[model samples]
Target: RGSHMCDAFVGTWKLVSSENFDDYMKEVGVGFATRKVAGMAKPNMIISVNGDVITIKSESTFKNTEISFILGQEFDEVTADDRKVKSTITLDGGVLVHVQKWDGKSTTIKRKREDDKLVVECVMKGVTSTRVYERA
Candidate 1:
């Protein structure tokens, strides 16, 4: 029926937890000072899905970044410093999971909506961070 696509995962999201940000940053080789500041800032996330295209943006007072890609397709992420990242994404059990392959390392972002809150988990190597928030 129709597109046969269940869009329970379609919508924008915000960050609330950001737990273990320091460890996550360290896993990605981020500098100490930047990690300190980045860890302290409250980061927000926004996600939009239109057909096969997906747009996600993470913003904070300290920094912001956006990524656009086609579902199940590989795309290059343009980092703040202009570095390109190879990323792929998929949806599982109404949750959107994005896996980014960069610099011989991989980062995974898992997102879901529960009640009135948005939950996000970022994992890289031995580090992981969880962030949650309400709708904006």
Candidate 2:
């Protein structure tokens, strides 16, 4: 653990369930081919810590992405959709809230711990995707 509230999230995780991911991606303007690949890939997540900083990595057959940040600090991010945006991540009690915005559009993803699973809720204007992960 890294002396942060995110300590409980430090683990290797494998995606086991995903819901409404396609609609979420489509609303985010992901192209058909990329959406197809993204929708089909079951990405694993690795959450790690160093000092007060936390880093999360998404691993998949299609594309891998990583971000490292201290809580409440904003930074530039190019999402899996290749959209450049401003990103911020913060911890709130039992949840880690991540927000991304670009070109007047924004999305929020909240990650929470539930029993032995990690629950992620990805939200956009008219879509929400829930993805569940298990410690691997």
Candidate 3:
């Protein structure tokens, strides 16, 4: 069997994930008080890709932020929480993998297709988290 992805994916993609995203908040360095509230809110991600450029917009009831970069090119990135970072991404086979380099710290996001779902793993300072998404 072959995999089929939307051509629109070449553009922008919004995020839809499951509940209880407390782990994600912690990985992003959200404070204890904020984390408590953030976990209860469902977050959405806005993603876009044009040629070699990719952008991600993550939004919740609390905040909204965007990150953009070129594939295979290392550049500065600023997270929604105001974290300064450097990042790059590449498609290995059909899996998209990226690494963020920050102040002596490194984080990575690895995405791949698994069965009928897209698996996303976000790794950061001593923590690794996973999320699953189905195409809508």
lDDT of each: 0.73, 0.91, 0.65
Best-performing candidate as measured by TM-score: 2
| Candidate ranking (TM-score, best to worst) | 2, 1, 3
TM-scores, all candidates, are 0.82, 0.95, 0.71
lDDT of 1 by residue, 32-119 (tens): 7777777677766676666666777878887789887777888888654344678888877777788878778788988777787777
In terms of lDDT, model 1 sits at: 0.73
For lDDT, candidate 1 versus 3, the one ahead is: 1
Candidate 2: tens digits of C-alpha lDDT, residues 1-136: 4276677899999999999999999898899999998899988999999987889999999889999998899999888779999999988887999999999999999999999999999999969999999999
Give the lowest summed-lDDT range of ten residues in model 3: 2-11
Most accurate candidate by lDDT: 2
The sequence of per-residue lDDT tens digits that candidate 3 reaches over residues 1-136 is: 2323422333233345643356766776678887776555555655666555667666778578776776677877776556788878877777778897776777788877677666678877667767766554
* lDDT score, candidate 3, position 111: 75
Candidate 1 at 66: error in angstroms?
1.5
| Cα RMSD for predicted model 1 | 2.6
